[PDB]
Amino acid sequence: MIQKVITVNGIEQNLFVDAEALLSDVLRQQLGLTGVKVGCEQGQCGACSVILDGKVVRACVTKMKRVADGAQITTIEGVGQPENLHPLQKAWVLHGGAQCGFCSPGFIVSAKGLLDTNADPSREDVRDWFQKHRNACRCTGYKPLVDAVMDAAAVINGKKPETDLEFKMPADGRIWGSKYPRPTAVAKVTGTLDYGADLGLKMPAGTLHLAMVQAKVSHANIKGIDTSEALTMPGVHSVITHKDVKGKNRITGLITFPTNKGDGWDRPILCDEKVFQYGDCIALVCADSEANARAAAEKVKVDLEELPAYMSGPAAAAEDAIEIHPGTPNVYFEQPIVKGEDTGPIFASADVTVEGDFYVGRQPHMPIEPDVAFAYMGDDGKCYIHSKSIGVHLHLYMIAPGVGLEPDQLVLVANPMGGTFGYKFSPTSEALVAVAAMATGRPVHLRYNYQQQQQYTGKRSPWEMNVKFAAKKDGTLLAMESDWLVDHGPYSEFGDLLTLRGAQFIGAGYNIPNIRGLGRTVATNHVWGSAFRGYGAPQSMFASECLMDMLAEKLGMDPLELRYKNAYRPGDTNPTGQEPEVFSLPDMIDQLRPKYQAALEKAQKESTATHKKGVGISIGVYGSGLDGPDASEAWAELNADGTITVHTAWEDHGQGADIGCVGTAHEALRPMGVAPEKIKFTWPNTATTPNSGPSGGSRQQVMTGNAIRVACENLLKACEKPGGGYYTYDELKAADKPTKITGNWTASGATHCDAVTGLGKPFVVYMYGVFMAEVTVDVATGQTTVDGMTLMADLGSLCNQLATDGQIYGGLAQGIGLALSEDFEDIKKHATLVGAGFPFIKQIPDKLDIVYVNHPRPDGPFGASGVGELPLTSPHAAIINAIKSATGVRIYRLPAYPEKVLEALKA
Ligand code: FES
Ligand code: FES
Ligand SMILES: [Cl-]
Ligand SMILES: [Cl-]
Ligand SMILES: [Cl-]
Ligand SMILES: [Mg+2]
Ligand SMILES: [Mg+2]
Ligand SMILES: [Mg+2]
């Protein structure tokens, strides 16, 4: 050990450290500076950026021996605090750069390092800086971050007053539709919002820290577990196995479809008889620290008989394949789509037909914050779980029978969280921590490292797809045929539903009177499927939107004009036979057309012999809601101090549940003139907030937005004075009148899609968009650079533009990753951010352009649709279409790795 006397955030610290210790650990654990965020732990994400003697360094890869006596360190806590914000922090808030907020301290610290060396950077300078310093963001698509740095620099340089970094009310006083900052922004930019791992460091002594004993093979029969060595290791309390589980030790898929051949109880909590995928948790070591628990977990011996594993859908779906879940066929669900007339004779007589085989793979969510959760036994006797769940009520029911608790005896709470992009539509660690808290009676905390985040949380499910179009010479679509195989890994939860998405979204956007198709779901031993933003659309629409360009090519028609010819218009129906609720695609195409023409001309003009430029188009469509008559609830409460709390379980992945609530409530409450700062939101809690539903299916703005609106309307009625005006809290209380008022809303016109035909009216609100990708392909290397993305977006009406701009930029960036670099195919190689193709800043163009063409929705609150998943529906199709435009080569199977593109170029 050594004494190190240094300065941290301007204060002399008399430090006692191990020379080998990581600066991140010292700062977080020894000094309580939890504003230093840790994600990847491998120097790849920059979340732990600190300034050390004028240089921006990643604290997770900086050992204390590299910290000189007398060194100066700055963390986010030293940059500024609430009530004392630095221009960079104010700018982040103004520009909405804090979505989940997990990368915000690291970006801001890094940015301060930049500005201290280059006071007046170009946008390009800012981008080069964040690239060099590995500052990664999964939420924002980077553009808002650069915006923020530029604005802060101008203030620091005296070129504009600091007061211009403060939001100015539109007054009208209307915050709906505005850039009003989100309530959580200040905490995020100051590092004072405690995420799951931060909470773990601030839990009491006697909290047990867990480590998972995980399967190191993909498929096995388990014979036994030997914990003897682990029990003797430092700090070890106990080891938990399936034997300690007090319930069924299974998670239920809960809404498993009746025609599913599986019962939906296939997923264990702790493996008992079988390993079903690499990473499966077989035991939990409870220890006094994460380090001690992990060390001991390595010594737990699992005796197993490895079995042949099926590592892809086609492999598992073979007629001969052995049942992974004995008693259930590997292909456990099929969804037909049967619209209009038989397609066979139509294809036979059509002027033109086209067909393609396409593949979209096992995209990893890659939030900067790896999975984390904790649990404890309350003094009330209930088991409390605090995690990254984005469906607290859903998860409660999915796990309660497995852990052996009645619904009333379990409470799930959503911690502030550093992104999920859908992986948290699934339980991950919740049942594990519950089991351990119940068994030990003590608080337990479980943090996954980045490898565990990659290998052992769910993934976008790969789809192998064949899609066909028949059309007239004039481009009119006559018929479509479709076949898709969904590789859902070993756990069935929502796999059937994902498969149904193919019936709803393959070929969405156009009038197609006649459809015959069949989706199939298959269990495999690759990673289990969890929702990934777009949930079936990124697969479905990659196929159909690529196929539309092939159709255009075959007709000798411009691909945008082919879409214009076919796009939804009054009278048309979508693939499930339902009338669209608005008709905005022709409008969007018409407004995009000149920008498209200009982009083509620029592409031709600026292409060289070695660097070929192209422009590609696609349409995206997706529902806002879960299928059928989805519903939400909110409570609007006048408090004693005149503030108003809007209680919901609107779960915040980081998308903006806070500002969604505040903005929607503010608009609903206008008659009573309620200032936005007086409106409070509630963190999701299954005991104390209503069942607003999960933040999945881009549904909360519509469902919970409506519920909030209704509740606020009902509060207004509760407060109304006879003769005009409104009663105060004290007045209502004096009259023994209610102050906490419920609102409910249901999408009553929606129906579930049929099990035989796929027909129905699954959502009452959809999101519609038109993408344009501009790319350059280096034909010597096969490397594609996305130089620009445009999204024409119909969101009905914007609750908040900082929120919606950010959502779209974030989705577009994930589109670039899905198109060019991302996958989780190799269990080891893809278990890091860099290995799995995470888009760093230079991979995302600065030119991300949005045009809102909003057609107010009959059923959305104040006309709003959702936005969440729209930007990831088909941007990767636009990009692939752009590569085709540039070079003449079509990539059918994502991602377009350079070697893959080169092989196609040279073929
Ligand atoms: S670079 Fe340190 S946590 Fe990712
Ligand atoms: S705001 Fe950057 S990772 Fe979420
Ligand atoms: Cl998906
Ligand atoms: Cl290909
Ligand atoms: Cl390659
Ligand atoms: Mg200042
Ligand atoms: Mg017609
Ligand atoms: Mg090769």
Short mmCIF file of C-alpha atoms in Angstrom, two decimals, residues 217-381:
data_model
loop_
_atom_site.label_atom_id
_atom_site.label_comp_id
_atom_site.label_asym_id
_atom_site.label_seq_id
_atom_site.Cartn_x
_atom_site.Cartn_y
_atom_site.Cartn_z
CA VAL A 217 -20.87 -24.64 -23.00
CA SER A 218 -23.96 -24.05 -25.14
CA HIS A 219 -26.01 -27.17 -24.32
CA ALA A 220 -25.75 -29.83 -21.59
CA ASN A 221 -27.34 -32.14 -19.08
CA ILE A 222 -26.29 -31.04 -15.59
CA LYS A 223 -25.15 -33.83 -13.23
CA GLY A 224 -24.05 -31.87 -10.18
CA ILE A 225 -22.59 -28.76 -8.58
CA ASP A 226 -19.69 -28.81 -6.15
CA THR A 227 -19.42 -25.65 -4.02
CA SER A 228 -16.92 -26.99 -1.49
CA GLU A 229 -13.85 -24.98 -2.57
CA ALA A 230 -15.90 -21.80 -3.12
CA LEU A 231 -17.26 -21.93 0.45
CA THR A 232 -13.72 -21.71 1.90
CA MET A 233 -12.74 -18.62 -0.11
CA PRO A 234 -12.37 -15.08 1.32
CA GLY A 235 -15.59 -13.23 2.13
CA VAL A 236 -17.88 -16.04 0.91
CA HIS A 237 -21.25 -16.31 2.70
CA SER A 238 -22.99 -19.09 0.79
CA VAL A 239 -23.73 -20.50 -2.66
CA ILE A 240 -27.30 -20.49 -4.03
CA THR A 241 -28.55 -23.15 -6.46
CA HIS A 242 -31.96 -24.29 -7.82
CA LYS A 243 -32.33 -26.16 -4.53
CA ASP A 244 -32.79 -22.81 -2.76
CA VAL A 245 -35.61 -21.67 -5.06
CA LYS A 246 -38.97 -21.67 -3.22
CA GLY A 247 -41.24 -21.63 -6.28
CA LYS A 248 -41.42 -23.31 -9.71
CA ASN A 249 -37.89 -22.17 -10.63
CA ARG A 250 -39.23 -21.15 -14.04
CA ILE A 251 -40.05 -17.80 -15.61
CA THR A 252 -43.36 -17.84 -17.49
CA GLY A 253 -43.76 -16.21 -20.92
CA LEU A 254 -47.15 -15.22 -19.40
CA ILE A 255 -48.95 -14.45 -22.67
CA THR A 256 -47.76 -17.54 -24.58
CA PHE A 257 -50.08 -17.92 -27.63
CA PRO A 258 -52.55 -20.85 -27.51
CA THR A 259 -51.14 -22.23 -30.81
CA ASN A 260 -47.60 -22.19 -29.37
CA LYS A 261 -46.60 -25.89 -28.99
CA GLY A 262 -44.68 -24.94 -25.81
CA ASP A 263 -46.34 -24.12 -22.45
CA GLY A 264 -44.15 -21.00 -21.96
CA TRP A 265 -42.63 -22.31 -18.72
CA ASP A 266 -39.41 -23.40 -20.46
CA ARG A 267 -36.99 -20.87 -18.91
CA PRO A 268 -35.38 -21.82 -15.58
CA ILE A 269 -34.40 -19.26 -12.94
CA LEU A 270 -31.34 -21.30 -11.90
CA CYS A 271 -30.49 -24.22 -14.21
CA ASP A 272 -31.52 -27.54 -12.74
CA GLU A 273 -31.48 -30.38 -15.29
CA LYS A 274 -30.07 -28.54 -18.31
CA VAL A 275 -27.86 -25.85 -19.81
CA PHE A 276 -29.70 -24.30 -22.79
CA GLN A 277 -27.20 -21.59 -23.83
CA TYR A 278 -23.70 -20.44 -23.03
CA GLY A 279 -23.84 -18.13 -20.02
CA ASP A 280 -26.87 -19.74 -18.30
CA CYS A 281 -26.74 -19.02 -14.54
CA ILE A 282 -26.30 -22.29 -12.62
CA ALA A 283 -25.47 -20.88 -9.18
CA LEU A 284 -24.96 -17.62 -7.29
CA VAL A 285 -22.04 -17.02 -4.92
CA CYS A 286 -22.93 -14.58 -2.09
CA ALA A 287 -19.92 -12.70 -0.71
CA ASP A 288 -18.88 -9.47 1.05
CA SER A 289 -17.86 -7.94 -2.31
CA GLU A 290 -18.24 -8.39 -6.04
CA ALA A 291 -14.50 -9.16 -6.37
CA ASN A 292 -14.63 -11.85 -3.69
CA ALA A 293 -17.87 -13.30 -5.09
CA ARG A 294 -16.37 -13.47 -8.63
CA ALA A 295 -13.16 -15.07 -7.37
CA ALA A 296 -15.14 -17.75 -5.53
CA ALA A 297 -17.53 -18.31 -8.46
CA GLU A 298 -14.51 -19.43 -10.53
CA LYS A 299 -13.96 -22.28 -8.07
CA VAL A 300 -17.51 -23.67 -8.19
CA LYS A 301 -17.37 -26.94 -10.15
CA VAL A 302 -20.25 -27.91 -12.41
CA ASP A 303 -20.42 -31.53 -13.54
CA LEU A 304 -22.24 -31.71 -16.86
CA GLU A 305 -22.61 -33.80 -20.01
CA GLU A 306 -22.17 -31.52 -23.02
CA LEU A 307 -24.74 -32.05 -25.78
CA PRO A 308 -24.67 -31.13 -29.48
CA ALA A 309 -25.83 -27.55 -29.76
CA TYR A 310 -27.94 -25.96 -32.48
CA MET A 311 -26.40 -22.55 -33.06
CA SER A 312 -28.73 -21.24 -35.79
CA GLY A 313 -32.42 -21.38 -36.70
CA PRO A 314 -32.02 -23.54 -39.83
CA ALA A 315 -29.90 -26.00 -37.81
CA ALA A 316 -32.47 -26.32 -34.98
CA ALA A 317 -35.42 -26.42 -37.39
CA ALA A 318 -34.20 -29.48 -39.34
CA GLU A 319 -36.87 -32.25 -39.37
CA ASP A 320 -34.29 -34.52 -37.68
CA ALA A 321 -33.13 -32.15 -34.92
CA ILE A 322 -33.23 -33.28 -31.28
CA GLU A 323 -35.73 -31.42 -29.09
CA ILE A 324 -33.86 -28.90 -26.91
CA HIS A 325 -36.92 -28.85 -24.62
CA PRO A 326 -37.85 -32.53 -24.54
CA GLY A 327 -41.56 -32.85 -25.34
CA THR A 328 -41.74 -29.65 -27.39
CA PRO A 329 -40.67 -29.48 -31.07
CA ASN A 330 -37.87 -26.99 -31.69
CA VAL A 331 -40.21 -25.21 -34.15
CA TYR A 332 -42.82 -24.30 -31.57
CA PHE A 333 -44.91 -21.67 -33.32
CA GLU A 334 -46.14 -20.71 -36.77
CA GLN A 335 -48.06 -17.62 -37.81
CA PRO A 336 -49.72 -17.60 -41.23
CA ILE A 337 -50.64 -14.43 -43.06
CA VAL A 338 -53.54 -14.95 -45.45
CA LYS A 339 -54.92 -11.75 -47.04
CA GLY A 340 -57.02 -11.52 -50.22
CA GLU A 341 -56.74 -13.99 -53.08
CA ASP A 342 -54.40 -16.96 -53.65
CA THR A 343 -51.04 -15.50 -54.69
CA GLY A 344 -49.89 -18.38 -56.94
CA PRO A 345 -52.03 -17.51 -59.99
CA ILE A 346 -51.32 -13.80 -59.47
CA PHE A 347 -47.54 -14.35 -59.59
CA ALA A 348 -48.05 -16.54 -62.66
CA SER A 349 -49.87 -13.82 -64.62
CA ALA A 350 -48.08 -10.70 -63.31
CA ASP A 351 -45.98 -8.47 -65.61
CA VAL A 352 -43.03 -8.60 -63.20
CA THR A 353 -42.05 -10.64 -60.18
CA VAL A 354 -39.07 -10.44 -57.85
CA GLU A 355 -37.79 -12.61 -55.02
CA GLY A 356 -35.02 -12.40 -52.47
CA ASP A 357 -33.48 -14.26 -49.55
CA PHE A 358 -32.46 -11.97 -46.70
CA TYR A 359 -30.96 -12.25 -43.23
CA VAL A 360 -30.80 -9.91 -40.26
CA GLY A 361 -28.90 -11.29 -37.29
CA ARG A 362 -28.46 -11.30 -33.54
CA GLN A 363 -27.97 -7.59 -32.89
CA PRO A 364 -26.66 -6.84 -29.36
CA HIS A 365 -28.31 -3.93 -27.52
CA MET A 366 -24.97 -2.64 -26.13
CA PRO A 367 -26.18 -0.09 -23.56
CA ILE A 368 -23.18 1.65 -21.98
CA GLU A 369 -24.37 0.43 -18.54
CA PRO A 370 -24.17 -3.35 -18.14
CA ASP A 371 -27.07 -5.13 -16.39
CA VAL A 372 -27.43 -4.68 -12.63
CA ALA A 373 -30.08 -5.29 -9.95
CA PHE A 374 -30.55 -5.71 -6.24
CA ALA A 375 -33.14 -7.16 -3.85
CA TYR A 376 -33.91 -7.23 -0.14
CA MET A 377 -36.54 -8.36 2.33
CA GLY A 378 -38.57 -5.38 3.47
CA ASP A 379 -39.53 -4.79 7.09
CA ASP A 380 -43.09 -5.37 5.80
CA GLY A 381 -42.06 -8.95 4.88
#
